[PDB]
Design a protein around this ligand. Structure first.
Ligand SMILES: [Ca+2]
Ligand SMILES: [Ca+2]
Ligand SMILES: [Ca+2]
Ligand SMILES: [Ca+2]
Ligand SMILES: [Ca+2]
Ligand SMILES: [Ca+2]
Ligand SMILES: [Ca+2]
Ligand SMILES: [Ca+2]
Ligand SMILES: [Ca+2]
Ligand SMILES: [Ca+2]
Ligand SMILES: [Ca+2]
Ligand SMILES: [Ca+2]
Ligand SMILES: [Ca+2]
Ligand SMILES: [Ca+2]
Ligand SMILES: [Ca+2]
Ligand SMILES: [Ca+2]
Ligand SMILES: [Ca+2]
Ligand SMILES: [Ca+2]
Ligand SMILES: [Ca+2]
Ligand SMILES: [Ca+2]
Ligand SMILES: [Ca+2]
Ligand SMILES: [Ca+2]
Ligand SMILES: [Ca+2]
Ligand SMILES: [Ca+2]
Ligand SMILES: [Ca+2]
Ligand SMILES: [Ca+2]
Ligand SMILES: [Ca+2]
Ligand SMILES: [Ca+2]
Ligand SMILES: [Ca+2]
Ligand SMILES: [Ca+2]
Ligand SMILES: [Ca+2]
Ligand SMILES: [Ca+2]
Ligand SMILES: [Ca+2]
Ligand SMILES: [Ca+2]
Ligand SMILES: [Ca+2]
Ligand SMILES: [Ca+2]
Lengths: 316, 5, 301, 301, 316, 303, 305, 4, 4, 4, 5, 5
């Protein structure tokens, strides 16, 4: 019995749209007293400045100690330099949670913000696109326990599909990130009398929802055993470990250079590209090792090699 | 009594 | 450099379906004790009457002081007079939150109500938070969250969607998607829905670019109405309220206009007028964006 | 005036899919301290054993009294014996909520688990509320919310959807979508899913109108079974339980019947019988039957 | 030798209970297909209306021609006006047999109906009494012979004992009666595609079973003969027939005004009050004549006069 | 381990009442046409003669071929000679079923006869009959008509104590079999003795006694009855019949595996001598598997 | 006018007797040809086996096609494990009807079987059967043979108090319906569970309690609604004088407030601290309505109590 | 002319 | 098509 | 050859 | 205590 | 020791 080398390939669109500056507007909220929305200012609790007249700030509550609570979203227009890259984390802006003590009952329970922008094709055709974001808000009753007193925001994983040069793209909310970290969260917790700023991360790719590029296969399909022996995957790992063979991790998420592998005992696998397109070179290959066992109990090891191919929207 | 949230 | 007037148009289906009386049934809930559902009665906590045998009331909890908490939905069949108008706020009924103090732990966490009718079933979902009661009465309020669910159905070969908008205090204009109700209190709200063509509900809309026909550029001002004498400054990228809807116009001339008004509020020959005002030299010019808001029938769509 | 007998038919796919053992992995979470994921062990708080190396356990918090809180999902591979039946409740596994007292602030707010099998992956989502603990033990319970997620996949050229139904106490019939668990306790629930044809999961259903072949009209009564001798009064627009599913019949004769039963519970030659009574403008009543054939088909169709 | 007049007396309780409306429920049955139990309606085969929500109708079988067979019991609450009289025929209701042709095998073999009603208990609390009725049913296979094809019902002579003001009483089923007739039957025969309605007759009286009031005696006890000339009754009759004397009917049932006499050759007799109490006046006396013969062959005639005394329940 | 002889006793009242001639009257019936009742006559279908004026005959139906169907009851006054013996089969009379073909639908479904007699205390026994005049076909067994008699009774007082007279059933004369239903062919008559018994108390019950044979046996204890039989079979020992009805001279024994027994006197008192003893044998087995046999001797005392 | 909650209670004896294996004997029958009785065997038509020598089988008729018709009763000694529970359905055994075609006229019309056991005190329950071997025709439903079992009983003494064992009837295994007559096709057998119950007193009676809910009401008053469970929020309409199923038994409540509640459940199904809850709505002369609860304790008690 |  |  |  | 929600 | 969730 002998395990043979397997080969696969996955395409990742690596490309960019030309886009305008983005404009954020708080459009709707439920409940709350003294709710205001506005374009950010350098007033103490004004949220800071942005290049537009959209109302990027929202506030609520009668203050019990100083300022009103609320949210603010400062766009990333400068650094985005007029471009959205595909299959690439995009910092749309920085979302700040302003949590202050307000008299109880005075806060919203939910709210929604529009982010609008135009998209140019190669012929100069502009396509207006609006992404809607939704937030559930829990201004918690304040007690002597400061962790329990934190206020909690929940961001929905909303998206928008739009057309460009005759094909569909989807922009999709991923979540919130502490700058300089890699963890995305979908809920934020903020202490009273504090602010909390997070990058708001989105991605855009082809099709009607956003999906990480992926490929699937079966590594046992080409392996060799007597007509009267069944084969089973008993080991898997990132990289080339053929000398040693491998044990365990069957059905675990296995991190490679560009993405993750799951390989099941019956040889079926899915590989998913999680890396930013910018991190993926030309001639990119992802290598895994697996070990198979046959009915006799004999083991054999081989490689699964998956070409990560950078392609264009036009060639997709 | 000056309950805050 | 010269700004040139711009024209656009947007169609709004203005029409109606013939429909039956609607029938509401609470079909499912999660958690809770002493949970009952029933057709409303004039018992004290019975919810009031409706013209059908659907179970429009739900209750839960062991009462600590008087009554059980729950929800009730009284349909608006009488005033709807057998009709759903398109792109028009519809009061499907009145939703009442009965919040009473019940022994802790006794309340549901969620529930679903069906609303059926002939032209179809709309499913509504509710998350429920019966909050632990303390000396702080605002913290002690119980909270309801309604989902923005919908149903698509066919009529004369085309798709329509009925969509939940949310809750409204009667005689007000604000829609909310969560309700907060004090203990030992009831809270009644209109439940607002809309129906229109297609597979989801979407407000009628049109898009364009006002700089496309201008002569030389950056938009530096926008406003509702005709302000050509003065020219305009600011509001680029803000939501600008007109008579029938809202405009957003960006610095590169791209705009979207969205009809929010009830169709009933939109006359024939309806036109929405905006003004906008700069070239590389720093010279300014002002012109108008005129949008027809056309009432059309389902057939003419 | 005379009510005539009606006949309907609803088809329920009754077949099975050959599937691998399933493998669960906790893939993502938000917030929390000391979060770990792992393949279950027979350590005290290790969750128990499963036949795979997927990380079926998640734990969090700095314990204040003994153990960390978390979740665990033990698959049902043994009893599922390599098969998913269509339109049949499937116990995918047993989900346990481990709620212990952890120092405040230390728990996740949400998390997501993948369940893979042959290559199809169902994603499950959970909102978590580790509530601040007080002297009120019901208020101190921690709450889990599971989403009704699904996955569509292809087989022999046609689409199937697997869909999360919710949580069930074993040996009971109630599905919930939220769990409440006391502090220093565990809570285990069957996780129930269903799979059927198409791009979402939908219970098989059929619709009609019973007055269409009547001779002369308002439906004034409806009931399960054959009650023609007596005639029937009431329940117009209520959910009427039959043997295999539910009927709603409105006053204008329109009805929907929905098969809720597990396919296993539906014999060959299965028929669902209802009775209705009609009233005409004269005030004269007449009663008849609505007979709906529930037909077990194959994926082949 | 000389026959001497004889006397006797018998008490009949004549009195009434206050009672509620009665409520009938079919509680159980054996065999049958499509068996339903429901409150009566004015549907064609619905049985008619009654003032309560008890299930007074039962039906069975798949109809072969129109309707299902069954039974229905419409109470007599209106005319009973809240009262049960003692030792008095009571029409509890009207029982109808609905016999239709049903596909063979589809009918019950038996069934039971409860009839419940309130009567004040030891403390004056209105609490219930329940009479259980039992029916054997024979839905006969239908042929060209219509008499053989009739379906047959048998009702049991069941009863219930209950307490009132410290003294027990027993309501008892007598049977079925064609209205306006006097014959009670315990079985009914009904043609196919027909209905048959009958009064259901019950009686209530004191004690642990229902028994017609009765008295016994011997008429020869006070008659006069020589020590060795035995006396024998050779005639008996209703009324006063002393002028003529009487011959025959010794040991026959002899109808009087209020009841029946049997008098045997050795002088022993039993008299039983069958009349409704309502038919029995004050100062009611029942008169019979008998003729005696002694060993010599000499005959003598006299009277047996039995007072029928109406008494209350207070009197026991 | 050793089985020890067991003794028991049972009393059977052996005695008689003085009674009058009995008088039968058909008092009630349900359904039927041309229903008549009467004192029997020597007319062809008149039932024969009896010493009284009670109506001992009943008839029904429109004859299709000759006579009407019905029932008749001729008392046994002559041979009873003024006496009812206790715990003794009594032929109260002879019941005849007259089954003739009558036009369909014409027969009763049920009927009731009184039998009155002095003991001087008047007593009345009520008898009940269900009647099935079956539709006649080419199958003569299916066409037979069927009578069912109830096992009714009457309790009455004598010298301050209660006696019950009880219907046992019907018997073909010169046979030992009692039945409670009769089947009679069309155009035929069927005569049966009507058998009753009277004894002390509020219902009639065969005299009986109960006990346990293992109670005095020696063996820790693990004893089980494994055999039983009528008579003395100690030499051989007995195997089987545990829990079966075992016929003795005067009655029946049932003995269970745990030693409990009931013995019931079925014999007519007339058949039971003075110094009557009923003997049975049983074999016991202990936990070791060792067997032992002994006797159960039950005295049958006439009182 | 105001309806006031009402309380009640009912005791159900929950307890068991120690009993021997039971022994069945066919003792008597009327009519029939070639009638035999015997202890069951594994012969084809022998009825199967039981642990005793009682004659549990009876047969009759000249066979026209194969076997003789008859009855057989296989006791349930193994599973009963030496115990009779009170107010609890007891499967005494399995009764099988063997219906074969026999030459016409050859079948019994009736028969009786004794079932004896010790409690030591022997006890004997007598069972009675009416039999109708119907003439066979082309109509197979009409040709079925019919059995009727009587609802007989026996009272016996234990530790100075009376108990009654009572026949309930026949049941298809795994179903809940009791019947008192069986119909069996020709050339077929039909097996059922013979269900009995035992409880205190001189006849068997389901535990029960009675009362009046209007007695403590505040005001003419009339019950206009009743239902199982707690429906006070809504109030209730209808079902006055209907049998209302609860968890453990049935309620009938009349318009004048009088009610009877009867425990039908097996004692095994009744927990400690068992309570049965009903709702009723009252209407006064003004036409005003008020709703309240009737709460009944169902108390498990021993024979000693 | 049926008979019983 | 027998009936009862 | 009738049977029951 | 008898806490309420 | 301290606040617990
Ligand atoms: Ca390979
Ligand atoms: Ca911007
Ligand atoms: Ca700005
Ligand atoms: Ca801004
Ligand atoms: Ca705050
Ligand atoms: Ca807070
Ligand atoms: Ca322009
Ligand atoms: Ca309605
Ligand atoms: Ca209503
Ligand atoms: Ca309703
Ligand atoms: Ca509350
Ligand atoms: Ca609260
Ligand atoms: Ca697994
Ligand atoms: Ca494992
Ligand atoms: Ca695992
Ligand atoms: Ca916790
Ligand atoms: Ca907690
Ligand atoms: Ca119809
Ligand atoms: Ca005299
Ligand atoms: Ca009534
Ligand atoms: Ca009624
Ligand atoms: Ca009724
Ligand atoms: Ca019929
Ligand atoms: Ca018939
Ligand atoms: Ca001994
Ligand atoms: Ca005589
Ligand atoms: Ca004579
Ligand atoms: Ca005579
Ligand atoms: Ca005849
Ligand atoms: Ca005949
Ligand atoms: Ca009350
Ligand atoms: Ca046994
Ligand atoms: Ca045996
Ligand atoms: Ca046996
Ligand atoms: Ca047969
Ligand atoms: Ca037959």
């Amino acid at each position: 019995s002998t395990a043979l080398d397997d080969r696969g390939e996955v395409d990742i669109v690596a490309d960019s749209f030309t886009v305008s500056g983005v404009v954020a507007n708080w459009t709707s909220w439920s409940n709350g007293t003294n709710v205001t929305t506005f374009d950010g200012t350098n007033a103490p609790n004004g949220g800071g400045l942005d290049n537009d007249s959209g109302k990027d700030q929202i506030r609520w509550g009668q203050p019990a100690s100083s300022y009103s609570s609320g949210y603010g979203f400062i766009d990333n227009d400068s650094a985005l330099n007029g471009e959205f890259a595909l299959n690439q984390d995009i910092i749309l802006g920085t979302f700040t949670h302003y949590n202050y003590p307000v008299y109880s009952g005075g806060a919203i329970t939910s709210a929604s913000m529009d982010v609008a922008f135009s998209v140019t094709d190669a012929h100069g055709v502009l396509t207006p696109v609006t992404l809607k974001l939704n937030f559930d808000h829990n201004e918690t009753p304040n007690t002597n326990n400061p962790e329990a007193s934190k206020d909690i925001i929940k961001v929905g994983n909303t998206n928008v599909t739009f057309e460009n040069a005759g094909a569909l793209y989807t922009l999709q909310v991923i979540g919130f990130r502490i700058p300089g970290t890699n963890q995305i969260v979908t809920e934020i917790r903020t202490g009273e009398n504090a602010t909390n700023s997070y990058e708001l991360v989105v991605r855009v790719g082809p099709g009607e929802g956003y999906e990480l590029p992926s490929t699937s296969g079966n590594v046992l399909s080409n392996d060799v055993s007597g007509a009267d022996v069944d084969m089973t995957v008993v080991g898997a790992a990132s990289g080339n470990h053929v000398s040693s063979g491998v044990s365990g991790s069957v059905g675990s998420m296995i991190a490679g250079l560009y993405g993750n592998l799951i390989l099941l005992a019956d040889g079926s696998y899915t590989y998913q590209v999680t890396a930013n397109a910018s991190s993926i070179p030309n001639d990119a290959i992802e290598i895994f090792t697996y070990t198979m066992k046959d009915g006799d109990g004999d083991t054999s090891t081989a490689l699964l090699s998956i070409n990560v191919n950078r392609v264009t929207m036009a060639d997709f | 009594a000056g309950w805050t949230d």
